[PDB]
Structure 1
Amino acid sequence: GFLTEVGEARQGTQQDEVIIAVGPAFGLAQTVNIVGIPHKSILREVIAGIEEEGIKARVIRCFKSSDVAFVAVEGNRLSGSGISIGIQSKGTTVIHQQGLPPLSNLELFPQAPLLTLETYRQIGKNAARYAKRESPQPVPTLNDQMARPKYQAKSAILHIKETKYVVTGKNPQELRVA
């Protein structure tokens, strides 16, 4: 595998670290995203995005909800920078920030099948730029009128399955590297 819980995740310190909050089945019951991009590669480009911006990249697995907004929110609480990136096993991703209501965000990627590894790295990059309070220009908008026709039912099944690993009230876990 590639992900190792290394205890309950502790509050951030420095405002120059970005947390990647991962759904409760990411890299476990599910290893690839809705179109086959592997979780390790996705974590790989996300981290590489942040780091190369010169910011720390911390990763936790979220438990109290499988909803991408809420798992991102879980992360923004602990991110020393207040910026976090929420990611579901199917691949849907969000860049959050403390002070925003859960169903608000900095940037949303609401059609997972359109994401690419190149998109994942941009997201990490941007998250880092936000963490330095840099105001990056947003990742270019991806949209396809047939994405739902082709993938929404599958998205549903994947979400159903990931959702079976939600633990109410359980605190995010810190995770170690490849």
Structure 2
Amino acid sequence: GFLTEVGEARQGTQQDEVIIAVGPAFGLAQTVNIVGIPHKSILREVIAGIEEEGIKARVIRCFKSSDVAFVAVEGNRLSGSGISIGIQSKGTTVIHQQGLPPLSNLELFPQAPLLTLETYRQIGKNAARYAKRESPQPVPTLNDQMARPKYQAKSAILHIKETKYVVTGKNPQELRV
């Protein structure tokens, strides 16, 4: 229950912030990612990673689309730095920025089951550096050729579920963690 609804999130007007956008069921209908890490630790670690870089960190929920690219774009439009962090309930995560095509990004973590808390931290960190207009070394590439064989079906199902909470045209909510 750590994520408290609170009014409709609004624009930045302050570059020194990074928004984290999460899916309509994040910490709601689902509270652990696809290999069971609680949303709370992931949220804690991303926020710690950004704050740790000296950047503000703002958490909002998106409802227009369960697709992670679009969740993150909903966020980058309102982030004062132009940088967002999108995360679905199953854990898939992307670092995005205003002006990018929705299906483009700064960095992407396309294999949710390989992500660790230490990974989620670094992501909070490389985002902040991006907000500072710095070009950090990308978080190293994690790839496992058996991840799809082990988890693609599970992922499908997790995603189908979060998708029931999509609600068209409903603006993203600012959240208190």
**TM-score with structure 1 setting the length:** 0.99
Trace 1:1-178 onto structure 2 (pairs within 5 A).
1-177=1-177
Shift of 1:13: 1.0
Q: Distance in 1 between matches of 2:80 and 2:101?
A: 18
Gaps of 5+ in 1: none
1:128-159 residue CA offsets vs partner (Å, 9 max, x unmatched): 00000011110000000000000000000000
Shift of 1:83: 0.2
1:46-94 residue CA offsets vs partner (Å, 9 max, x unmatched): 0000001000000000000000000000000000000000000000000
1:2-55 residue CA offsets vs partner (Å, 9 max, x unmatched): 111110001011111000001000000000000011000000000000001000
**TM-score with structure 2 setting the length:** 0.99
Q: Distance in 1 between matches of 2:45 and 2:74?
A: 22
Identical-pair percentage: 100
Q: Distance in 1 between matches of 2:34 and 2:133?
A: 32
Q: Distance in 2 between matches of 1:10 and 1:127?
A: 20
Give the alignment's Cα RMSD to 1 decimal: 0.4
Q: Secondary structure at the residue paired with 2:7?
A: strand
Q: Distance in 1 between matches of 2:50 and 2:132?
A: 11
Shift of 1:97: 0.1
Gaps of 5+ in 2: none
Q: Secondary structure at the residue paired with 1:5?
A: coil
Shift of 1:161: 0.2
